[PDB]
Amino acid sequence: KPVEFVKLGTGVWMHTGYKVVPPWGNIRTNGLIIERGDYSVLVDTAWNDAQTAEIVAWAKDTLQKPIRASIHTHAHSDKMGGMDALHMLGVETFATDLTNRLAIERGLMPAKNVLNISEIGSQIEWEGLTILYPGGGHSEDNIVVNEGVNNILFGGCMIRPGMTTSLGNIDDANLGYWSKAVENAANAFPDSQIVIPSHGKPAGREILKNTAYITRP
Template identity: 35%
Template sequence: MARLGLLVALLAGCASAPVAPYAHPTADDVAPGEIALRQIRPGVWVHVSTSDLGNGLIYPSNGLVVRDGDGVWLVDTAWGEAATAALLDAVEAEIGLPVRGAVATHFHDDRVEGADVLRQRGIPVYASSLTQRLAAAEDNAVPSDSLAGLTVPGTAVRLGPLEVLYPGGGHTRDNLVVYAPGAGVLHGGCAVHEMARTHAGNVADADLDAWPESLRLVRERYPEVEVVVPGHGYPGGAELLDHSIEIVEAAQQD
């Protein structure tokens, strides 16, 4: 389940109105199995869930909810089946629109662990074929639907209101980023770190050599991005891409 490596790594180490860190839900605000929604742009919400990694460490994870007309799309499941069920309840109660589908940005359990819950509700979960294979090999929940064409760095597909980009290897070999062009919001997943992070984190499945160039490709493709949401921690702006490049390049020297 890739949790031990994540625990060790963690212990080691916008538009008209910028994202305010103090307003972003933290592990103190969200218990495991629960969910918090925070609207960051019109039609775009961050969903925050947490997991107990042991030794008293409760760690948060970010995904997105993006409006698509009279429905919404999810970027990543919540962290766990109970939290994903809570996410669906929160979307119904706070947004009031049905979930059309979801996309998983890589194979780790903080991105896919609720895939079976969504499938049981008739909600497709899209991912690259590589993510499906890696999730199955890790004995994680496997996204139900494959996105074709995401095999070469720089390739992208449209999924409702979202552009799903494969920038190349990074935090994992299969990591994707997801851009909501109508809102200027980029979900970087775990390829992108919050500003408070000073270490590359869990690199057990990483491609450290490719990671900085993958992030440069993202930066060049979306120069107009206004809000960048990392896989964990506080959102920010495009500076998160440069920050992540810096700390990954430092990790290459370790």
């Protein structure tokens, strides 16, 4: 049951934690730890505050590059629940202005720092990562995160795992646009051959294509 860590490329680690949700049971969630010299930054938390604390302790004690900032990819409880816990551990949290506003509407805490990328297709660089807003998909505010040195694209919940045809949690999905959002991300990062969904194994670009097909009306 401890959070698991694996190295995906130079300066890039993946964390993976599990939670049990009836009826189907165990489900994984993935995030990234990105080395930034003397410190590291976090791309999405684990399921809960205890697992997120494990990630912070691992960066401090095993990597010996403490996590000092983090980015959060949309306004859902498993992504935004840890804003205060990260704050209490001295991590500067980041999210888009839209994610913060939706977080507050949905009864969640916003990130402490805001990134402005409101137009579909707009990008910003943050801690050496490219942050793209590709339009609504899984959630209206979902962003993706591309690491250009290793060409690793983190898709979060917006990318479905494997060859599934299931859609995951679509309570807040933009079913009109989600397929186009996936194509926007694929076109924005053509060199990224490693794609990380929130809930499955790391894979190639075939999961961008599969997601786009299965979420299209």
